[PDB]
Chains A and B, each alone.
Chain A
């Protein structure tokens, strides 16, 4: 048992944050990839599944579900329909920056992880879905896959032994709902961006009907390290339920906003100041804290002074967890204007299948514009609370929920600021 756990060198999952001495298949070879993987991929998929459930991997991308149960859904007896492994690589949720760094520096560990997953669940091919905004990094992944094919290291007869496994990089076309679990799957199919109804799971009917699965790049990147390294090495970092290292990154108002790893729990003040420069104007200067990126309610100062960055800790703090905007924002800014631009984001990138998220995000964006100009009475701000209660949980996907939560956090914490804004507009009108 530790004092909540904190960062420790040389037990980082990946190296090459930026520009270590080499980049090649030979680069990852000297950095310690593709090492003794033949006996690993010949040992048996139950060993990989038991090793993952032993280490206790938490699903990333705001999942809240374990990877072991999903990849145990993937062990159906093989019909005439193949099994696919699809790696999501979109970065919506402004403040994400997560797998851009991995796919820009170490593509070979993604090749590691997709081959380990495909050999280790009975899958057949890995579709790597990349965002349409990522041309240079996408062709970097292309050149790395060309090098992996040039060594003959993946493909047919993987690792020499008799198993075929192909990887296909499919770009996007610019979307955020393709970043989700299933509109992804239909955007592979050639149809437009549309999520599916849940109780037929992608584990049984997926890409055209393949019993397939979807994985996030952090889970794919940790998936060879869990196999080639020991058990509970990964599980000794944090609590019992969640354990591991996450990319904690800061984009906001600090000195030199940037990206690091850490363990699962951290004092948030030490994370913000003692790893990434320092808060612009001191620790008292901040107005609020957001975790999660953009699909997570805000946190004030008095709450965040004791917040450890665990999943259950933020659920007890009535929020969620994510990446790259685990930040503060200054008292010198209009937090109503920032939240209203986030609601404009949710309006501009959402499909219009479900009537409630469509019309509710319409009301929330027009009402937040009216509150930027302060043009109502407080019954309207509690009506905004009522609609943000009624949107959540009545949708196909989680984008309606992710649009419902920041308005909820604002009405939870900053009631008197909205009262004072609307009172100033009342003084302005008369």
Chain B
């Protein structure tokens, strides 16, 4: 949405932004992994470090990465506008992404969306009239074999219901983040019924190998 900057101060460089010299040591590690002659390959990890340090990246951050990695700025603007993570708009301390496409909608994501909606108050896409509760529904995150799923910042949540929704929301309002594991039993990605996996502790190297 609205992929032209439209300057709007609290943007419009130079907005005050800078890294840490410890983060410069991080950037030395990042452009030490990659082969010499192709320094421009680390734009995406360095800009990811910018998104992890500052809450949302401004145009000043992209200009600073253009200063560091001595590329033209326009390719940095391309890569930052292309992907999903790099929210150029400001977001909150906590960023709800409700994954719902084909199996997640088929496992009743609508009560989940309405529970988030009427417990939080604000509609999807936009934010809350404070911080920490921006909300988007997203495409496939990776854990399809469970409930229509919740991503918060670097964490997942599975096996949902509106009272679990109220538990997670009340414990984020109290700050006490729960474990990122699933709910309602099945403590891993498991067949939650009658243990169809192997039962014996596997031996390993003792049984059949050849020419080793």
| A interface residues, Cβ below 8 angstroms from B | 9-10, 12, 15, 17-21, 29-33, 35-37, 39-40, 43, 91-97, 100-101, 131-136, 168, 170-176, 187-193, 208, 228-231, 233, 249-253, 255-260, 275-277, 294, 324-325, 327, 329, 333, 337-338, 341-342, 344-345, 348-349
Contact = CB atoms under 8 A, between A and B. Distances in A.
A31 B206 CA distance: 10
Interface string B73-114: 001001100111110000000000000011111110000000
Contacts of B191: 256, 258-260, 275-277
Contact of B202 (A31, A131, A257, A259): A31
A341 B40 contact: no
Contacts of A231: 210
Nearest to A339: B102
Contacts of B187: 18-19
B33 interface: yes
Interface string B177-209: 000100000111111110011100111111111
Contacts of A276: 191, 196
Given A95-B103, A256-B192, A345-B102, A230 B41 contact: no
A80 B46 CA distance: 29
B154 interface: yes
A230 B208 contact: yes
B21 to A, nearest CB: 23
Given A94-B140, A329-B106, A345-B101, A208 B38 contact: yes
A173 B144 contact: no
A378 B139 CA distance: 31
Interface string B4-31: 0000000000000000000000000000
A20 B146 CA distance: 21
In the complex, the 4 A-B pairs of residues with the closest C-beta atoms, listed nearest first: A32-B204, A174-B84, A36-B212, A18-B188
Contacts of A176: 139
Nearest to A30: B204
A389 B133 CA distance: 44
A178 to B, nearest CB: 9
Interface of B: 33, 35, 37-38, 40-45, 48, 75, 78-79, 82-86, 101-107, 139-146, 151, 154-156, 180, 186-193, 196-198, 201-212
Contacts of A338: 102, 105-106
A136 B180 contact: yes
Nearest to B97: A133
Contacts of A275: 191, 196
Contact of B139 (A19, A101, A348): A348
Given A187-B44, A341-B101, A193 B83 contact: yes
A139 to B, nearest CB: 9
Contact of B210 (A15, A20, A31, A229): A229
Nearest to B81: A192
6 contacts: A10-B202, A18-B197, A36-B205, A173-B79, A173-B83, A258-B192
Contacts of B203: 32
B100 to A, nearest CB: 8
A338 B107 CA distance: 11
Given A31-B202, A132-B85, A190-B41, A97 B144 contact: yes
| Most chain A beta-carbon contacts within 10 A, residue among B75, B82, B102, B151 | B102
B142 A93 contact: no
Given A251-B103, A257-B145, A325-B144, 13 more contacts: A12-B198, A18-B187, A29-B204, A31-B204, A32-B202, A32-B204, A39-B212, A94-B103, A170-B45, A258-B145, A294-B102, A325-B103, A333-B106
Given A133-B141, A257-B145, A94 B212 contact: no
A302 B44 CA distance: 49
A255 B193 contact: yes
B30 to A, nearest CB: 10
Given A17-B190, A171-B45, A251 B145 contact: yes
Contact of B196 (A175, A260, A324, A327): A260
Nearest to A275: B196
Given A97-B189, A101-B189, A260-B196, A228 B144 contact: no
B208 A15 contact: no
A229 B209 contact: yes
A333 B205 CA distance: 49
Contacts of B156: 136
B139 A345 contact: yes
B75 A191 contact: yes
Nearest to B212: A36
A250 B145 contact: yes
Contacts of B139: 94, 176, 345, 348-349
A21 B200 CA distance: 11
Contacts of A277: 191-193
A30 B103 CA distance: 37
A341 B75 CA distance: 32
Contacts of A193: 82-83
B209 to A, nearest CB: 5
Given A35-B209, A325-B144, A192 B102 contact: no
B105 A341 contact: yes
Contacts of A30: 204
Contacts of A348: 139
A294 B154 CA distance: 26
A36 B209 contact: yes
A189 B41 contact: yes
A192 B101 contact: no
A97 to B, nearest CB: 5
Contact of B85 (A174, A337, A344): A174
